[PDB]
Structure 1
């Protein structure tokens, strides 16, 4: 038994349930840092229940809201924007990323001052959104999958409406033509390198197909 096994065996049921659901509404947060403030999180900051830190042994500012008390199943999104526009992109998305209605409890953004300009996580993939199965038995529910898909589509729309220029999608990730910023990989069944073979495998991931079709 596994998260992905449940997705395979309920593939059409989940998809059909999702397409019948009304549009998700996300109350956007206002009492949030801008990108500069985000970089100043240090040891501890908090905005809208998301604990913030920028003091780890890595180049990211991490955001974590307490999860409902399934286990991480590898499913995650990157957001790629033009390197120069990360601060504006972050601000535009902050209402959604810190929303009390967001299905994403754990995410991270590159600290652009900690990386060389031409770095993988500088030219693109400046955000990572980590998805966890919402049910106690580590299964995804249709309600949550719908919410998650609606959420990333809201992120797409906000960036597009703000005229944010797209970034350089990492070689590791896949995305459909209608995702100009968002991309996907599964951490359990793919690597950071990528390649056509890996990208081909990722396109078959039930989770990815449920997000796109």
Structure 2
């Protein structure tokens, strides 16, 4: 149909899944020279760490992180993840994940974390979904490569294990997202085909997203 990133996943659904399941473990050299959560909130107008431009300048309640996109990279296709932890443990969770989030090997060029001092405690992005990781197709024609999907899945699974290994308590996953039982913190939604309001109907549609299935099955 019109071709698009998702059309490609649908038509190469099994090829991608099979290629991914044959690849060797991904390795991410974690960064050490990174800010802690307090440092992140001090980003203000502008800060830099491992190539990620940081800012906590205002408008919204988040601290943003963005590394320059490769010329070979495609256009955002809606795929993204949230990370939900106990509200009280966001600073510790951030620190635990910093080495991966700022990694020169990370597949995620853009992400954001809630500034807990800018939101009310009972807020949707306060009780959970305190991190948002944006994914985009890695190939010039806006298609996902098997290599990149495997790397992304490996990365999200590393985030999961790091938080669990740190014994971080889980948060309240947003109604908008879906996640399998083995993801205790991560959740997913595609912003091109879903909104922020929950509903089993939207979760149902999301569960059928080829990208989500490739990330979980």
Q: TM-score range by the shorter chain?
A: over 0.9
Unaligned runs of 5+ in 2: none
The TM-score with structure 2 as length reference comes to: 0.98
**Distance apart, 1:194 and its partner CA:** 1.6
Runs of 4+ in 1 over 3 A off after TM superposition: none
Q: Note the alpha carbon deviations across 1:33-92, whole angstroms, 9 max, x for none.
A: 000000000000001110000013100000000011610000000000000000000000
Q: Note the alpha carbon deviations across 1:118-167, whole angstroms, 9 max, x for none.
A: 00000000000000000000000000000000000000000000000000
**Distance apart, 1:174 and its partner CA:** 0.1
For residue 197 of structure 2, what is the aligned residue in structure 1?
193
Q: Note the alpha carbon deviations across 1:142-197, whole angstroms, 9 max, x for none.
A: 00000000000000000000000000000000000000000000000000002100
For residue 31 of structure 1, what is the aligned residue in structure 2?
33
- 2:44 maps to which of 42, 45, 48: 42
Give the total of aligned pairs: 213
The TM-score with structure 1 as length reference comes to: 0.99
User: Over aligned residues, Cα RMSD in angstroms?
Assistant: 0.5
Unaligned runs of 5+ in 1: none
Q: Secondary structure at the match of 2:170?
A: coil
Q: Distance in 1 between matches of 2:69 and 2:38?
A: 26
Q: Note the alpha carbon deviations across 1:93-121, whole angstroms, 9 max, x for none.
A: 00000000000000000000000000000
Matched, 1:4 2:6: yes
Q: Distance in 2 between matches of 1:47 and 1:72?
A: 23
Q: Distance in 1 between matches of 2:138 and 2:75?
A: 9
**Distance apart, 1:4 and its partner CA:** 0.1
- 1:81 maps to which of 67, 77, 85: 85
Q: Distance in 1 between matches of 2:188 and 2:64?
A: 19
Q: Distance in 1 between matches of 2:58 and 2:81?
A: 21
